[PDB]
Amino acid sequence: SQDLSEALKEATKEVHIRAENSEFMRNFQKGQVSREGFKLVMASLYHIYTALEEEIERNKQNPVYAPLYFPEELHRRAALEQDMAFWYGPHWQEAIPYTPATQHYVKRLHEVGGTHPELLVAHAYTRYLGDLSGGQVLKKIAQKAMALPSSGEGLAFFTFPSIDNPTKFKQLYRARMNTLEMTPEVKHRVTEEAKTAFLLNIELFEELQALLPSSFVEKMKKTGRNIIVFYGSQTGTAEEFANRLSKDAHRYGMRGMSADPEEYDLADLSSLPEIDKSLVVFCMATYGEGDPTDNAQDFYDWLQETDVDLTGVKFAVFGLGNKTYEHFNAMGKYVDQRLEQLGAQRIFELGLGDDDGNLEEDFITWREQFWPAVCEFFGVEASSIRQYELVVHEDMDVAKVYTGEMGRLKSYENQKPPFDAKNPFLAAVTANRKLNQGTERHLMHLELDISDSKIRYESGDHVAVYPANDSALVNQIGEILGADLDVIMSLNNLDEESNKKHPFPCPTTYRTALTYYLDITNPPRTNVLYELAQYASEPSEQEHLHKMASSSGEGKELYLSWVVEARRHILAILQDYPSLRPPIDHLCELLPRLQARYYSIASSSKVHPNSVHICAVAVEYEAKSGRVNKGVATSWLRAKEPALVPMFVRKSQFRLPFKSTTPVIMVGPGTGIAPFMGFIQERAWLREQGKEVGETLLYYGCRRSDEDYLYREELARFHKDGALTQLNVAFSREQAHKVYVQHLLKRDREHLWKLIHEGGAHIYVCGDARNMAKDVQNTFYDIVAEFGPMEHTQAVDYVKKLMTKGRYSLDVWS
Numbered sequence: 073s074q075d076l077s078e079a080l081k082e083a084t085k086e087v088h089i090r091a092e093n094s095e096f097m098r099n100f101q102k103g104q105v106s107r108e109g110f111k112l113v114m115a116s117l118y119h120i121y122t123a124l125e126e127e128i129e130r131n132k133q134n135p136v137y138a139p140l141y142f143p144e145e146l147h148r149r150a151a152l153e154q155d156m157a158f159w160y161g162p163h164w165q166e167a168i169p170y171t172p173a174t175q176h177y178v179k180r181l182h183e184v185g186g187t188h189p190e191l192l193v194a195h196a197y198t199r200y201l202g203d204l205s206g207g208q209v210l211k212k213i214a215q216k217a218m219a220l221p222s223s224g225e226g227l228a229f230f231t232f233p234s235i236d237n238p239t240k241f242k243q244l245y246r247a248r249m250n251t252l253e254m255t256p257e258v259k260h261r262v263t264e265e266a267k268t269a270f271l272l273n274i275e276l277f278e279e280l281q282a283l284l285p286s287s288f289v290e291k292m293k294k295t296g297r298n299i300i301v302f303y304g305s306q307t308g309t310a311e312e313f314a315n316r317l318s319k320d321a322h323r324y325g326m327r328g329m330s331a332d333p334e335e336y337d338l339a340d341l342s343s344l345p346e347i348d349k350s351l352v353v354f355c356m357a358t359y360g361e362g363d364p365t366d367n368a369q370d371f372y373d374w375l376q377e378t379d380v381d382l383t384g385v386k387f388a389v390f391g392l393g394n395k396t397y398e399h400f401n402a403m404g405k406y407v408d409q410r411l412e413q414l415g416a417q418r419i420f421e422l423g424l425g426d427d428d429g430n431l432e433e434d435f436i437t438w439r440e441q442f443w444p445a446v447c448e449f450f451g452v453e454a455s456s457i458r459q460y461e462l463v464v465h466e467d468m469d470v471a472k473v474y475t476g477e478m479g480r481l482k483s484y485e486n487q488k489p490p491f492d493a494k495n496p497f498l499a500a501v502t503a504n505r506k507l508n509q510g511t512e513r514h515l516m517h518l519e520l521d522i523s524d525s526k527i528r529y530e531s532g533d534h535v536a537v538y539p540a541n542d543s544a545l546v547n548q549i550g551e552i553l554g555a556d557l558d559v560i561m562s563l564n565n566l567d568e569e570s571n572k573k574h575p576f577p578c579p580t581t582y583r584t585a586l587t588y589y590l591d592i593t594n595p596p597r598t599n600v601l602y603e604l605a606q607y608a609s610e611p612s613e614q615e616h617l618h619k620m621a622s623s624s625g626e627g628k629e630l631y632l633s634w635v636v637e638a639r640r641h642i643l644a645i646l647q648d649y650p651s652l653r654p655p656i657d658h659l660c661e662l663l664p665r666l667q668a669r670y671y672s673i674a675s676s677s678k679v680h681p682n683s684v685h686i687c688a689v690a691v692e693y694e695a696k697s698g699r700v701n702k703g704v705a706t707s708w709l710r711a712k713e714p715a716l717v718p719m720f721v722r723k724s725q726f727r728l729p730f731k732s733t734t735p736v737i738m739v740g741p742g743t744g745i746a747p748f749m750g751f752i753q754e755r756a757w758l759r760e761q762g763k764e765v766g767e768t769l770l771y772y773g774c775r776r777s778d779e780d781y782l783y784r785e786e787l788a789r790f791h792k793d794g795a796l797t798q799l800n801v802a803f804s805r806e807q808a809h810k811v812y813v814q815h816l817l818k819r820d821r822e823h824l825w826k827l828i829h830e831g832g833a834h835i836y837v838c839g840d841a842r843n844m845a846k847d848v849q850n851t852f853y854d855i856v857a858e859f860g861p862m863e864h865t866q867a868v869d870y871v872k873k874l875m876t877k878g879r880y881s882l883d884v885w886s
């Protein structure tokens with residue numbers, strides 16, 4: 073096409089297929105990689121990326137490459153050196169080979185970087201964009217086929233810790249590519265050079281392949297088991313889940329096994345009710361276009377044309393899938409919906425594990441609420457074996473006890489860079505004023521000083537904050553539970569080969585754990601109610617706690633209405649159920665960890681390099697349980713008056729256009745104005761530096777002009793200085809009919825289309841507002857369909873392409 077990204081994708085169409093159909097890459101896809109060939113490719117890649125990043129550093133400020141300089145996010149030389157130390161020993165510097173094809177690739181890289189830097193992009197595209205696509209699956213295939221540690225050693229090349237969303241980053245990178253100004257002949261040369269890079273990788277792969285030359289029912293009867301967990305896996309995740317599930321059985325009073333469904337005629341599911349309290353679990357991954365894993369093909373086909381009566385069979389299904397595919401969890405959903413059709417009854421609800429988000433967290437939640445449901449369905453209420461052992465340290469020095477820090481001991485006092493999720497920096501609160509003018513809600517503007525923390529950030533990045541629970545809650549819990557909160561203790565995992573030795577930093581006090589390490593605020597899960605049922609004296613409340621552990625039946629109605637919908641925290645449950653008198657160590661073992669909370673940075677590092685601004689609305693509501701609930705992070709921050717806040721910075725892909733002349737169309741109702749402030753600041757700064765700045769359009773939305781008009785004075789000043797071109801504010805509560813930002817976009821349709829089509833503008837959408845992103849999206853669909861004559865399909869394809877080129881960025885949350 074005309075934009076460089078689309079031209080590069082279209083030009084390299086055939087060579088990408090040829091590269092991924094090379095014998096080595098095909099064997100890699102099928103899990104047949106072997107250790108020697110992997111060492112070969114990794115050493116070759118070490119040489120290749122060394123040369124590539126050498127030339128990148130050489131031309132990092134040449135205008136023909138400058139917009140593509142992403143060392144913190146993309147560079148691989150360090151991870152490749154780690155992997156060389158792993159795969160070739162401590163003296164890898166002289167032990168790694170240097171094959172002729174690798175030298176050919178390195179020579180081409182050096183020629184480009186030395187005499188034709190305008191082509192260097194074509195090589196980066198060929199490598200980095202490829203690493204951010206298939207790589208994530210290849211790492212898994214590497215982990216299982218070669219049995220590497222789960223800690224990631226040897227596969228550091230496949231890990232990008234500074235890219236939390238490779239799709240959005242690829243969009244940003246395509247955007248940075250299209251900014252490169254070049255003549256059409258140069259564009260054609262660049263596409264041909266991308267073809268050349270693909271061919272170099274292809275012949276490298278070819279050369280490296282030239283250097284290589286009994287029924288389970290009676291089985292469970294003779295082994296004495298009542299649980300079996302079939303896993304449908306291809307890269308080992310469902311296998312791991314099924315193995316952990318069967319492992320919990322022995323540690324729950326029951327007895328289970330994880331088996332491969334391939335070499336078993338599942339017609340033995342009719343023979344399964346002949347085992348006392350038998351239940352079968354299926355951990356099913358789905359591949360292709362809703363196709364089963366190969367190891368489960370015989371299973372899947374069997375459920376096609378069959379009529380085996382499965383009456384009295386107990387089953388449960390957990391699916392492994394990805395929401396980006398349009399056949400989400402087809403295999404798990406099919407197994408679940410089909411086992412009940414043959415007569416079996418569901419014990420626990422079908423789990424839908426998403427791989428786009430945190431699949432591990434979804435599975436942990438599913439298992440945590442699954443085991444109590446089984447124990448309540450079968451009636452084997454024997455109360456399960458614990459997992460953490462209490463050890464009281466009655467005499468111990470204080471310099472050895474965790475006092476609330478997150479990483480190493482005394483890491484909050486001995487603060488040394490780098491600062492990240494495991495070592496947050498304690499920033500001093502310099503400002504904490506009120507932006508809201510009325511009294512509906514409290515909306516605040518905080519400022520955190522990060523002077524000598526060596527922390528970098530850009531407009532659009534996020535800042536995460538570790539809060540602390542309200543001390544009154546902790547004291548009330550310690551009172552009503554009748555225990556001493558200042559008891560220094562520890563909880564040790566007696567699962568000796570599980571390196572998760574503690575539920576939180578230990579040794580520490582119960583007060584510190586309740587304040588900094590635990591949640592004690594969100595509605596409790598099923599597992600904690602089940603494990604607390606054994607501590608209720610009255611049989612009414614004990615039976616309530618037991619019934620709430622059942623996913624099926626009027627227990628779920630009790631659990632959802634009285635706990636979730638009513639928003640009862642742990643203290644409210646201990647209050648309304650006075651029979652509950654459990655110990656405090658078991659409670660600290662059962663409660664989930666306190667999560668950090670993210671906020672869109674509301675400042676530009678080019679004008680506020682030593683400060684991070686936050687714009688947040690305080691959470692405070694009247695729960696349906698009578699009590700008034702407060703948000704942890706927002707209340708904790710509201711109390712901060714100029715006072716340290718443990719925070720760190722997470723990189724996002726929300727970025728202003730590289731060219732200052734490019735216009736921006738920002739849309740952010742309410743708190744979604746947070747990052748745009750920074751944008752505007754930086755934009756204003758670029759005008760003050762004497763640079764030519766394009767149009768800057770803001771579409772903000774609030775209720776009343778005198779209630780929650782955030783940054784009214786600052787935005788007005790920005791507008792009158794010329795920095796903010798248009799201030800289009802939609803007030804949703806000022807007449808009979810409500811007005812949202814969608815209507816203001818619909819109004820300026822013509823100018824917006826001239827900005828998008830002729831000016832090549834960037835569109836931004838941000839905020840909490842529910843169902844707002846799709847409304848803005850449909851509005852842009854209609855604008856593009858109207859002015860630039862198009863069918864609706866052509867317009868939605870135009871907008872999706874803009875999203876691909878990194879011109880339509882979203883940063884929504886909840």
Ligand SMILES: Cc1cc2nc3c(=O)[nH]c(=O)nc-3n(C[C@H](O)[C@H](O)[C@H](O)COP(=O)(O)OP(=O)(O)OC[C@H]3O[C@@H](n4cnc5c(N)ncnc54)[C@H](O)[C@@H]3O)c2cc1C
Nearest residue numbers: 669670671672687688689691693703704705706743746885
């Ligand atoms: C990338 C990202 C960026 C973000 N940027 C911002 C930002 O710029 N500004 C900002 O303010 N927030 C932002 N957030 C959201 C923020 O992280 C928190 O979700 C929010 O600030 C509240 O945190 P909290 O700890 O105070 O409340 P929590 O302790 O976490 O409790 C919140 C829960 O309370 C419940 N709840 C809330 N209101 C009610 C109600 N009337 N009735 C019943 N239940 C209710 C809800 O179930 C809600 O989930 C962002 C989130 C992400 C992921």
Ligand code: HEM
Nearest residue numbers: 077080081091092097101197198199201202205206270273
């Ligand atoms: C194991 C074999 C491979 C498979 C299955 C594979 C698969 C894919 C897929 C599905 C995409 C599209 C992702 C997206 O559009 O966001 C992609 C993109 C890409 N792949 Fe790979 N790939 C493989 C190997 C390679 C190799 C060897 C290279 C070159 C060294 C490469 C370079 C790229 C590039 C440049 C893109 C980006 C295309 C674009 O969007 O412009 N891939 N790959």
Ligand SMILES: Cc1cc2nc3c(=O)[nH]c(=O)nc-3n(C[C@H](O)[C@H](O)[C@H](O)COP(=O)(O)O)c2cc1C
Nearest residue numbers: 305306307308309310357358359360393394400401
């Ligand atoms: C080629 C391929 C196709 C996939 N197709 C789907 C799909 O159609 N639907 C879905 O929900 N997930 C799909 N996934 C996501 C997988 O189900 C997910 O990665 C799962 O965790 C794999 O589990 P495993 O490691 O045990 O094989 C697909 C993954 C790959 C690699």
